[PDB]
Every structure is written in structure tokens, then in C-alpha cells.
């Protein structure tokens, strides 16, 4: 009656790969969701499914969104 555990994956290569691919997938999902539910642009003629761009909106005060840090 000696207990056993699950196989732990302590490998730096596969941990870097997992964190990288999860970050890339969540940022791709976020940008496709935000480009689909708003005004969109396109590099190609009538191209919304592949490479959708969030449309450029003008700010009333652009230095506040440019120069200010968001994580501090």
C-alpha cells in the first residue's frame, strides 16, 4: 500500500513551448474576436476571415494612450 503519483513534466524546453503556444493562441483568439465584433479593415479585398485587422480609431487625446504606462 505505497502510494504513487502522476508523471511530472519538469522540462524547461516543453514548459517554454507550452507557455509560448498558449500565449500565442490566447492572443490570436482575442484579436480575432475583437476584429470580428467591431469595425474591421483588410489588407486584401473583402478579407475578414483571414487576417482581420481591428480598424484604427482616432483618440481625442492621443498622448495619454501613447506615453502612459499600463502595468506599473
Partner 1 sequence: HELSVEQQLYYKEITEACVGSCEAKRAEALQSIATDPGLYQMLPRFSTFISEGVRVNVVQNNLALLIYLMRMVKALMDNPTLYLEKYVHELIPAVMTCIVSRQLCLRPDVDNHWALRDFAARLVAQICKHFSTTTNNIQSRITKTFTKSWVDEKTPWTTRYGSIAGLAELGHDVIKTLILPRLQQEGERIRSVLDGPVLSNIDRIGADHVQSLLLKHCAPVLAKLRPPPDNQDAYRAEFGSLGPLLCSQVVKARAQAALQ
Partner 2 sequence: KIVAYELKTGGVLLHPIFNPASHLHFSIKHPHTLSWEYYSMFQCKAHLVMRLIENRISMEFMLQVFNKLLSLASTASSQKFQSHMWSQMLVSTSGFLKSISNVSGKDIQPLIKQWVDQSGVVKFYGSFAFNRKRNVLELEIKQDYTSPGTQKYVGPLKVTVQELDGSFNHTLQIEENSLKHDIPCHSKSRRNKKKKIPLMNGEEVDMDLSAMDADSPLLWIRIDPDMSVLRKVEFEQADFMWQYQLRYERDVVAQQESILALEKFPTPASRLALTDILEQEQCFYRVRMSACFCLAKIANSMVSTWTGPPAMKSLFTRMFCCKSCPNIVKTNNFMSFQSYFLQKTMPVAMALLRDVHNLCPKEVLTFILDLIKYNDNRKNKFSDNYYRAEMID
Which of 37, 49, 50, 65 binds partner 1 (CB under 8 A)? It is: 37
Which of 14, 15, 29, 48 binds partner 1 (CB under 8 A)? It is: 29
The CA distance from 21 to 42, in Å, is 25
Which of partner 2, partner 1, none lies near 51, with the C-beta cut-off 5 to 8 A by kind?
none
Task: Determine how many CB atoms are found less than 10 A away from the CB of residue 53.
Answer: 14
φ, ψ for residue 44, nearest 5 deg: -110, 160
Which of 32, 40, 42, 54 binds partner 1 (CB under 8 A)? It is: 32
Question: Per CB under 8 A, which region of 6-14, 20-28, 45-53, 54-62 contacts partner 1?
Answer: 20-28
The CA distance from 18 to 13, in Å, is 9
Amino acid at each position: 500500500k505505497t502510494p504513487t503519483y502522476r508523471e511530472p513534466v519538469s522540462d524547461y524546453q516543453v514548459l517554454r513551448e507550452k507557455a509560448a503556444s498558449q500565449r500565442r493562441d490566447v492572443e490570436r483568439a482575442l484579436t480575432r474576436f475583437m476584429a470580428k465584433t467591431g469595425e474591421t479593415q483588410s489588407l486584401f479585398k473583402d478579407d475578414v476571415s483571414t487576417f482581420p485587422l481591428i480598424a484604427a480609431r482616432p483618440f481625442t487625446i492621443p498622448y495619454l494612450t501613447a506615453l502612459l504606462p499600463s502595468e506599473l
